[PDB]
Amino acid sequence: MQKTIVVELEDRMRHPLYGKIIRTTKKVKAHDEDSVAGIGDRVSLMETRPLSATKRWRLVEILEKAK
Amino acid sequence: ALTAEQKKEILRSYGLHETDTGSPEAQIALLTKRIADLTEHLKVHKHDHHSRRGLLLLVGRRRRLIKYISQIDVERYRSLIERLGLR
RNA sequence: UCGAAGGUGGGAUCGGCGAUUGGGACGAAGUCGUAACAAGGUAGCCGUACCGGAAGGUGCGGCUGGAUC
RNA sequence: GCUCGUAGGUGGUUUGUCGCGUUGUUCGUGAAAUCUCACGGCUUAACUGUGAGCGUGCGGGCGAUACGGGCAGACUAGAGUACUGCAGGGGAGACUGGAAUUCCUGGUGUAGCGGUGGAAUGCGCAGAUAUCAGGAGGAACACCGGUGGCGAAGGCGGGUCUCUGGGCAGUAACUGACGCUGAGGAGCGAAAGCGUGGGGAGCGAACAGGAUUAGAUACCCUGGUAGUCCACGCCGUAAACGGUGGGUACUAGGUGUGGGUUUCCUUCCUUGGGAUCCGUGCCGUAGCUAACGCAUUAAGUACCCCGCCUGGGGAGUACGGCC
RNA sequence: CAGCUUGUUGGUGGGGUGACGGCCUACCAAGGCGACGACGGGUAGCCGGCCUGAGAGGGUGUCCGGCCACACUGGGACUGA
RNA sequence: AGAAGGGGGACCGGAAUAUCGUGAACACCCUUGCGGUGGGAGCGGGAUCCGGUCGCAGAAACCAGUGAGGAGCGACUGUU
RNA sequence: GCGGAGUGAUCUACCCAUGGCCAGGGUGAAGCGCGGGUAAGACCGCGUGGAGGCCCGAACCCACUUAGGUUGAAGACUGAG
Ligand SMILES: [Mg+2]
Ligand SMILES: [Mg+2]
Ligand SMILES: [Mg+2]
Ligand SMILES: [Mg+2]
Ligand SMILES: [Mg+2]
Ligand SMILES: [Mg+2]
Ligand SMILES: [Mg+2]
Ligand SMILES: [Mg+2]
Ligand SMILES: [Mg+2]
Ligand SMILES: [Mg+2]
Ligand SMILES: [Mg+2]
Ligand SMILES: [Mg+2]
Ligand SMILES: [Mg+2]
Ligand SMILES: [Mg+2]
Ligand SMILES: [Mg+2]
Ligand SMILES: [Mg+2]
Ligand SMILES: [Mg+2]
Ligand SMILES: [Mg+2]
Ligand SMILES: [Mg+2]
Ligand SMILES: [Mg+2]
Ligand SMILES: [Mg+2]
Ligand SMILES: [Mg+2]
Ligand SMILES: [Mg+2]
Ligand SMILES: [Mg+2]
Ligand SMILES: [Mg+2]
Ligand SMILES: [Mg+2]
Ligand SMILES: [Mg+2]
Ligand SMILES: [Mg+2]
Ligand SMILES: [Mg+2]
Ligand SMILES: [Mg+2]
Ligand SMILES: [Mg+2]
Ligand SMILES: [Mg+2]
Ligand SMILES: [Mg+2]
Ligand SMILES: [Mg+2]
Ligand SMILES: [Mg+2]
Ligand SMILES: [Mg+2]
Ligand SMILES: [Mg+2]
Ligand SMILES: [Mg+2]
Ligand SMILES: [Mg+2]
Ligand SMILES: [Mg+2]
Ligand SMILES: [Mg+2]
Ligand SMILES: [Mg+2]
Ligand SMILES: [Mg+2]
Ligand SMILES: [Mg+2]
Ligand SMILES: [Mg+2]
Ligand SMILES: [Mg+2]
Ligand SMILES: [Mg+2]
Ligand SMILES: [Mg+2]
Ligand SMILES: [Mg+2]
Ligand SMILES: [Mg+2]
Ligand SMILES: [Mg+2]
Ligand SMILES: [Mg+2]
Ligand SMILES: [Mg+2]
Ligand SMILES: [Mg+2]
Ligand SMILES: [Mg+2]
Ligand SMILES: [Mg+2]
Ligand SMILES: [Mg+2]
Ligand SMILES: [Mg+2]
Ligand SMILES: [Mg+2]
Ligand SMILES: [Mg+2]
Ligand SMILES: [Mg+2]
Ligand SMILES: [Mg+2]
Ligand SMILES: [Mg+2]
Ligand SMILES: [Mg+2]
Ligand SMILES: [Mg+2]
Ligand SMILES: [Mg+2]
Ligand SMILES: [Mg+2]
Ligand SMILES: [Mg+2]
Ligand SMILES: [Mg+2]
Ligand SMILES: [Mg+2]
């Protein structure tokens, strides 16, 4: 993405009626000033101002690099 | 087929420590050998559906073992892939 | 430059009517047959093919949700 | 209809860490009226004012790891692999055998044969039926054969050979949760039918004649085409049924059969009884059910996954879409 | 309704805004959204509230209150905090 | 199916001195040849964008498919 | 018109042998590669390739329409299609 990265985030929210716990996955665009990230490459993200049209996150640090 | 010594040859070729038979590596090697033999047989007798089902079962088992070894150890997965063949 | 409205064109989608025509439901006390319920008079069903006014009949394969020794 | 498997859901024992789910407290917020408790005022009520609940939630800090979960490990029980034996109509290809029917040729031989409840159509007298001998051809494999075996299902036995699948038993030899189910998707899938070439003994839709009957487009008889057969494709439908989805744990017994193993009674020759595993039948305890019935091969007691129903016709039909 | 998008996704340099931003512009990459249902069709103001129901739930948005959208239809600028 | 229906087309200048692409002279090495590499002169080609200019008209004259819908017959190319 | 005997395939019909000719554009079959796809596939997309009683169209071969000619330039032609 030429200084941007796409990061999959997941969360769990209880069903309003049945009450089961379910898992849903999302997708956010994160700013990478120096684009160093591959497939996997767990990253912790903190949300910023609207840096671009569809970017509201920035890179904080790289933890648990890809195996 | 896969006679006794035929199995032993692949077992010593792809084993872990001189006696391994149930590791994903040895199991995948033996399954690949069986699959290749079965496909070569199936080029003849194209209507042997009762054996084509067994070939499909072996393919599924090998796929599951490959997935397990890939999830458990990427380096071993890559080594086995280069040693045997994928896509 | 962009820009509402308007014109030209091929399409997309949703409805209405339509000579004629197919099947369905209900009506009466009509006409032609008795196919099923008994072994219902040729046991009954299931898939397919063919045939015949119609229900239906025949063949192939299967079931007993029938019987027999 | 069966099977496989994508995503997904779900998951053995044990150790450590985090504390995301979980839960507790605290703070902020969750407007007012209206909903409720308690009061106050319109003569009462409706109406209205006040105090507290409501506002099921969210954000922040501070406590817990009992369960789910993330990570890092470990174990063998699940699961898979290994080695030794076991049974089998599991499947494909190739070669080959006998009986029988029909047909052909010749011999013997003359007036009937066939068919039914009764007949007639039909066949023979131009030599039929019958009998003998030889030959040609296709289909199906009596006896074994069963209540049996195998296969996911559909299905599977004349014999021999080649190739190949699966299962069961035993040791625990090896890995170490690698497992279960599976939306879509894919493969397999009786008979009938379709395309191309071959084959066609017998049977036999359609069709024809005879017979029954008021009629007989049928049941019966005489014939007879596709088809049934082979090769490669297509079609994907059955009461494809156990009318019962897959996996696991538990829940008295009694009595047959099949494949193993195991000590003992080991000669009580008995290949019997006893123990265990995998099946296959019947009867039967509890339990379930409207009843019939199920009952360790559950329709009983629980869990996980997928599929399906919301009165009967219209209708599994119309339109659209895929093949 | 099974494939949707090209200022569309991102980056760079400018321009623009009270303010971040393809908001606009010139160049570079090929990306971004989709079975957890995009894109498409039908319908509709949302909520506090109101009704019914033991409750969960089912229906509803009218008095009043909060907001949003509109002012014959469609489009645009200016003044001004 | 060239379905149908649309848009652009002239000249001058700039981009533009390898802009790009064609061939490859002077001059660069070695097994010295009818040899190899770099090199880029001179000469030709095409396209695009931006700006300007002229006319009634930029395909410029000559040259150069009309298109669509419904039926009948024969499948079609061909032959008489 | 009938019979006998002969002559003719330098026109025309068909056939045999041996030679020649077909400007220029367009379309893009099989096969061959690469990638995607899978266990393998089937299949799919990019290239290459240059098939066809293929398309447009001169030479060439025809003869559909129309006008002229019709004591013709010509006992069957010319012009435009
Ligand atoms: Mg930026
Ligand atoms: Mg009408
Ligand atoms: Mg009757
Ligand atoms: Mg009947
Ligand atoms: Mg009767
Ligand atoms: Mg009857
Ligand atoms: Mg009939
Ligand atoms: Mg039938
Ligand atoms: Mg029958
Ligand atoms: Mg079933
Ligand atoms: Mg069914
Ligand atoms: Mg069905
Ligand atoms: Mg999965
Ligand atoms: Mg899982
Ligand atoms: Mg667990
Ligand atoms: Mg899990
Ligand atoms: Mg009072
Ligand atoms: Mg309140
Ligand atoms: Mg808190
Ligand atoms: Mg085990
Ligand atoms: Mg065969
Ligand atoms: Mg014969
Ligand atoms: Mg004789
Ligand atoms: Mg005889
Ligand atoms: Mg170990
Ligand atoms: Mg499964
Ligand atoms: Mg499925
Ligand atoms: Mg058949
Ligand atoms: Mg056939
Ligand atoms: Mg045939
Ligand atoms: Mg008749
Ligand atoms: Mg008959
Ligand atoms: Mg017959
Ligand atoms: Mg037919
Ligand atoms: Mg098929
Ligand atoms: Mg069956
Ligand atoms: Mg169930
Ligand atoms: Mg079960
Ligand atoms: Mg079970
Ligand atoms: Mg038993
Ligand atoms: Mg019983
Ligand atoms: Mg029941
Ligand atoms: Mg239908
Ligand atoms: Mg339709
Ligand atoms: Mg741009
Ligand atoms: Mg920019
Ligand atoms: Mg509205
Ligand atoms: Mg209730
Ligand atoms: Mg308006
Ligand atoms: Mg008005
Ligand atoms: Mg207006
Ligand atoms: Mg003012
Ligand atoms: Mg102002
Ligand atoms: Mg055109
Ligand atoms: Mg047309
Ligand atoms: Mg002018
Ligand atoms: Mg033209
Ligand atoms: Mg017509
Ligand atoms: Mg013609
Ligand atoms: Mg025809
Ligand atoms: Mg003469
Ligand atoms: Mg002559
Ligand atoms: Mg040409
Ligand atoms: Mg090609
Ligand atoms: Mg041609
Ligand atoms: Mg001619
Ligand atoms: Mg004339
Ligand atoms: Mg004249
Ligand atoms: Mg003429
Ligand atoms: Mg001419």
Q: Decide: CB of A11 under 7 A of nucleic strand E.
A: no
Q: How many other C-beta atoms can be found within 10 angstroms of the C-beta atom of residue B68?
A: 14
End-to-end CA distance of chain B: 25
Residue with tokens 């150890």: B73
| DSSP state, residue A61 | E
d(CA B40, CA B33) in angstroms, rounded, equals 11
In single-letter form, the type of residue at position B25 comes to E
Which value, to the nearest 10 degrees, does the dihedral of the CA atoms of residues B10, B15, B20, B21 take? -40
Q: Which two tokens stand for residue B16?
A: 């872990």
The reply to whether B74 has its C-beta less than 7 Å from any atom of strand D is no
Closest listed residue to residue A37, CA positions, set A60, A55, A56: A60
Which residues, at least 6 apart from B50, have a Cβ–Cβ distance to it below 8 Å?
A: none
- List the B47 CA – C51 C1' distance (angstroms): 38
A9: left (phi over 0), alpha (psi -120 to 50) or beta: beta
Q: Which nucleotide is at minimal CA–C1' distance from B30?
A: D81
Distance, Å, B33 CA → D122 C1'? 69
Other Cβ atoms within 10 Å of B42 Cβ, number: 15
DSSP conformation class of B76: H
Distance CA A67, CA A63 (A): 12
C-alpha–C-alpha distance, residues B2 and B86, integer Å: 22
Place of tokens 């609207």: A50
Resolution in A for the shown PDB structure?
A: 2.6
Asked if strand D comes closer than 7 Å to B57 Cβ, the answer is yes
Q: Closest nt to A26 (CA→C1')?
A: E36
Strand D closer than 7 A to residue B3 Cβ: no
